[PDB]
C-alpha cells in the first residue's frame, strides 16, 4: 500500500504554525518521487539525508508536520534558527534528519479582504524545546503573574497573519510540510518502492 | 544562534595557493550543506562553492572551476576552500554559508537557499 503522502501535502485545510499537526506514517511503501517537483516546492531542503536518494532508503517510521507561515517566515523553519516562529512555535533540533518543504498557497489561503485565521505565538516565558508544541491561550504578562486582557502590560500571546492577494511574495501564505525520518532499531516499516 | 566563523584569510601573490576554513564553535554542522561566497568590491556577493553534508555532491562557480576545491571534515566540524592559481579578480571578502541540502542544485545562491552566513574574511591577491 502506498504511503498517504497525498493526505498531507496536497490536502485541504492546514493548521496554524502554533498548533502544528503531526501525522505518523508507518507500514507502507513511500514513493518520494511524487515530491520531485522543483517549481512546485519553492523550499525543498533536506538535512542529514539526500533528497534524490530517499527512494533507496528504509526507515522505522516517518513523521510529517503541517502548518502555515508567511513567506518571510519560511526561512525560520531550519535547524537552530532564531526568531518568533522558530523559538515560540516550531523548533527543529540541530541534529534534525529530514526534509523541509514549502510552497506558495496564496490562491487558497489569501483573500482580497484578507484572511486572518492563521495565527502565530509571539510571546512566551521561555523558548520551545525541539518538537515541543504549545497550544495554550492564556494572557501573557512580563512578570509571569496572571492578568485579565484589558489591563495594562497584559497581552494576548497569539497574533494572526494578514494574508492578502495584493501583497508581495514575502507576505503571501506558504504551506510547510516537515518530514522526519526515524531510525529506532526496530523493523523498518516505511521503505522505498520495489 | 549559529555563528559561522571564517579562518585563514590574508594576502597572497598571484598564482600561489591559500586554504580557507569555516567552523561553528558549539553547533554541529554534520547534517548541513556548507559552501562559500565572495564579495568583490563594488559588486554584489558571488557564489563560489558548495558541498553537501556527506560530500556526495559538490558544486563550483564557472569562474573558480578547477582551481578552487571545496572539502569538509565532519569530525572537525569544518569546511575548507583550497584556492590555487589566484588572480587579482579573486580579491574579495569570502563568506562562509550553512544551509539545507537542496533537491534542486540551482537553489544554492543565498536568500532562503542558505540559512546562515558568516561575517567574512578578506582574501586579496597582490
Amino acid at each position: 500500500n502506498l504511503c498517504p503522502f497525498g493526505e498531507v501535502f496536497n490536502a485541504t485545510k492546514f493548521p496554524s504554525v502554533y498548533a502544528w499537526e503531526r501525522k505518523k506514517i508507518s507500514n507502507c511503501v513511500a514513493d518520494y518521487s511524487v515530491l520531485y517537483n522543483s517549481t512546485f516546492f519553492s523550499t525543498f531542503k533536506c538535512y542529514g539525508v539526500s533528497a534524490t536518494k530517499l527512494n533507496d532508503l528504509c526507515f522505522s517510521n516517518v513523521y510529517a508536520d503541517s502548518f502555515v507561515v508567511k513567506g518571510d517566515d519560511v526561512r525560520q523553519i531550519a535547524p537552530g534558527q532564531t526568531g518568533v516562529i522558530a523559538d515560540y512555535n516550531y523548533k527543529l533540533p540541530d541534529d534534525f534528519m529530514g526534509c523541509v518543504l514549502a510552497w506558495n498557497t496564496r490562491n487558497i489561503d489569501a483573500t482580497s479582504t484578507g484572511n486572518h485565521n492563521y495565527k502565530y505565538r509571539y510571546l512566551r516565558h521561555g523558548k520551545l524545546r525541539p518538537f515541543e508544541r504549545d497550544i495554550s491561550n492564556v494572557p501573557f504578562s512580563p512578570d509571569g503573574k496572571p492578568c485579565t486582557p484589558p489591563a495594562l502590560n497584559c497581552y494576548w500571546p497569539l497574533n494572526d497573519y494578514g494574508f492578502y492577494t495584493t501583497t508581495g511574495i514575502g507576505y503571501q501564505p506558504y504551506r510547510v510540510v516537515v518530514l522526519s525520518f526515524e531510525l529506532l532499531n526496530a523493523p523498518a516499516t516505511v521503505c522505498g518502492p520495489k | 544562534q549559529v555563528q559561522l566563523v571564517e579562518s585563514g584569510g590574508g594576502l597572497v601573490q598571484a598564482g600561489g595557493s591559500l586554504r580557507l576554513s569555516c567552523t561553528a564553535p558549539g553547533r554541529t554542522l554534520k547534517n548541513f550543506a556548507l559552501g562559500w561566497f565572495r564579495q568583490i568590491p563594488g559588486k554584489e556577493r558571488e557564489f563560489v562553492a558548495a558541498i553537501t553534508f556527506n560530500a556526495d555532491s559538490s558544486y563550483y562557480s564557472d569562474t573558480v572551476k578547477g582551481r578552487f576545491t571545496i572539502s569538509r571534515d565532519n569530525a572537525k566540524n569544518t569546511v575548507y576552500l583550497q584556492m590555487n592559481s589566484l588572480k587579482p579578480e579573486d580579491t574579495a571578502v569570502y563568506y562562509c554559508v550553512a544551509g539545507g541540502n537542496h533537491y534542486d542544485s540551482a537553489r544554492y545562491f543565498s536568500e532562503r537557499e542558505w540559512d546562515y552566513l558568516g561575517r567574512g574574511t578578506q582574501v586579496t591577491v597582490s
Partner: nanobody
Amino acid sequence: QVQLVESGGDLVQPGGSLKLSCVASEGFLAYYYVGWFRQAPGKEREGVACTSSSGYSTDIADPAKGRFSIDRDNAKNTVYLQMNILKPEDTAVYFCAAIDQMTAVRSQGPCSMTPNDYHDWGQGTQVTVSS
C-alpha cells in the same frame, strides 16, 4: 550487530538455475545495502550483484548482466540472488555483504559492487556447476 548467513549452494549442470538466500540474523537487514560476491578458486573476490536498502537501485556485474538478478524481502530479512544459464565460469563460493545505509549513500551510483566497501560479511556458500 547484524550477522549474515548465506544458503542455497548446490551442484548444477550447465544451463541450470540456482537461487541463493542471504538471511540476516540479529540486526535487521532493511537498513543495509547488500551486495553479492563470489570467489573462484585461485582468484580474487569479485562483486556479482548489488542492491539498495529498498531495492530501488540495484546493479549486476558485467559477467552476470542478463543472467543474474537480485531481489530482497525486508519482511523476511533476506536478500536473494537468482542465477540463470549457469556456466562453469560461475563455479565459486558466493558471499553476501552488508553496508549500513547513509554510509552507502555517501558514494554515488546505485550501490557498491566493491568488496573493500562492505566490511560486514557472511560465511559463504559453494556453487559448483558441471561441464
